[PDB]
Amino acid sequence: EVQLQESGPSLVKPSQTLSLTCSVTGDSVTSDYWSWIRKFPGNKLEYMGYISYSGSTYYHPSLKSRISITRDTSKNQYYLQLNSVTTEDTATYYCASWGGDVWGAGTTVTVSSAKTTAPSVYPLAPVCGDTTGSSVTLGCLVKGYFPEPVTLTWNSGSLSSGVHTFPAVLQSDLYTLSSSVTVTSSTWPSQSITCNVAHPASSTKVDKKI
Amino acid sequence: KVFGRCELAAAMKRHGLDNYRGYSLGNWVCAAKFESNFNTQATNRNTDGSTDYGILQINSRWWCNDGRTPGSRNLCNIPCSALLSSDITASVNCAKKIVSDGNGMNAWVAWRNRCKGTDVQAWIRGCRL
Amino acid sequence: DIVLTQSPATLSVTPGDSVSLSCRASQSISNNLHWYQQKSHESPRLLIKYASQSISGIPSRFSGSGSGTDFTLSINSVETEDFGMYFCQQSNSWPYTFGGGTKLEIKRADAAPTVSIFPPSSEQLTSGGASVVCFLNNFYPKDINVKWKIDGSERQNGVLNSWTDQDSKDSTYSMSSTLTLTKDEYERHNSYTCEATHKTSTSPIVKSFNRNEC
Fold first, then answer.
1. Which cysteine pairs are joined by S-S bonds (chain B)?
2. Which CATH number covers residue C67?
3. Peptide bond preceding C59: is omega within 30 degrees of 0, i.e. cis?
4. Are residues C82 and C166 in the same domain?
């Protein structure tokens, strides 16, 4: 069975070139037409282009000039080059057969000039050790980090129910994420509740007691 | 089966060939006429181990698989036998993929020689479609 | 470029119900319209090709119809694994283009959001920043409006929101809204309010706090 896999830098700086590789297995890269499709953050899809048997390519005009699609028969792969990128080229990129029967898992490419930055972790507690109902929700604000992702746990994983960890958003070129944990009023502050945030890119992991 | 000219034109319009990538319906009707006289069972052996199949005489060397052609690429990822059916579905899907390459309908020599740059619309003229 | 319009933007159904999704083209494209399914965290999957041709290996509940500029993807008896995004794509003319998509979501009983507001932490203030956070959790339907108010004035600038996908556990939705100010701005005002308007009540849920107290 034919299978596709994208690979290449996950981060490209503005004005620089974005390069991705699609490895074809199962069948020859000379025995089908191949395409590149991208999905922007908002979820909209754009058909970037394709390369057919003769080597002829078709590129999307609302892009065209910056894009180039090539293939290597000896390695059985085909590529995507997109010049002069800007933050707007941030998206999930997929390689697929022209027929659409086969797709790679997709790979995220982020365009940013930001540098690796460890997150600042802040505790979110009710306005002064408050408590009203039978329950209380606490939170953790993870701000100013780059790049994604971060792993957030509560009490090193010993507190896993009633949790809501939201998708990070981009604020001033840096990511911000938050998580809320809800427990019974008879649990906190009686028992300690700590937010654990790990950021692989910066080899950091911090704890924040609420 | 052997399609009637207008009958095939209507089936081709139904199968979305009219203005597919810029090629008006006449081009396809004309190509079919010169390629097989509208005969879905048309077959043709080539000097090499390949055979052309169907109403649009698609080759087994590059486009379809007949399990006995040397250097088969099966670009259309379809059995060549599917191109001999009275149901033109497969022949049209493959034809659409062929024409989606850089050399469009120039893939069909008969088309270039006897259709390319002519009053192709004349082929569907008279047909109530 | 050919524009494809899909509707509704979103559809909430109960597993077992049948559904019809629409896709309209700005120009006639005959039968050169294809349908894709895309689940969260996954790549697209081709369901129907050329308006109505079935794909061997795709569940029989999926079928397509239409021609020219009006197309329809039907799912007779939606199953629990069918929720996600559905897009149509035309291949009649280059550039190939996609519709905006339709989101197929799970229907369940309405639920009011549980709202919590949080002041900036002492740690952030020490660094010169001040984020006010508001969590709106486990509500349904998805449609909701969050309004921030400082000293009684509605505030738009500095607000960033984040939504989780429909909850795997109870099919509800959750949201986080954060108002980011500088320490100076924050200390210049007193009342901070997070106001949530939702279908579950004509009166908006209001969570607030004043710096003049604790």
1. 6-127, 30-115, 64-80, 76-94
2. 2.60.40.10
3. no
4. no
B7 annotated active-site: no
- B residues 30..89 contacting C (CB < 8 A): 89
Do both C59 and C32 map to the same domain?
yes
Is the CB of residue A17 less than 8 Å away from at least one CB of chain C?
A: no
Is the peptide bond prior to C119 cis by the omega test (within 30 degrees of 0)? no
Cβ of residue B112 closer than 8 Å to a chain A Cβ: no
Range A1-113 classified under CATH 2.60.40.10: yes
* Nearest-CB residue to C30 (from B20, B89, B93): B20
**C-alpha to C-alpha distance for B50 and B62, rounded to whole angstroms:** 9
What span, in angstroms and rounded, lies between the C-alpha atoms of B101 and B106? 10
Structure tokens at C17: 């119900």
Cα B34 from chain centroid (whole Å)? 10
> Which of A127, A169, A182 best tests the C interface by mutation, with the highest count of C CBs <10 A?
A127
Q: Provide the chain A residues 88-147 that lie in CB contact (below 8 A) with chain B.
A: 98-99, 101
**Which member of B18, B52, B66, B119 is catalytic?**
B52
Helix (H, G, I), strand (E, B) or coil at C155: strand
**Strand spans (E) along A26-162:** 34-39, 45-51, 57-59, 67-72, 77-82, 91-97, 107-111, 120-124, 135-145, 151-154
Q: Which amino acid is at C85?
A: M
Question: By the CB < 8 Å criterion, does B106 face chain A?
Answer: no
d(CA A174, CA A187): 34
Resolution reading in Å: 2.0
- Across the interface, of C100, C133, C161, the residue whose CB is closest to A139 is C133
* Determination approach: X-ray
Is the domain spanning B1-129 CATH 3.30.870.10? The answer is no
Q: What is the CATH number of domain A114-210?
A: 2.60.40.10
List chain B gaps (C–N > 2.5 A) by preceding residue: none
- By C-alpha distance, which of C93, C80, C74 is closest to C14? C80
Catalytic residue among B18, B35, B48, B119: B35
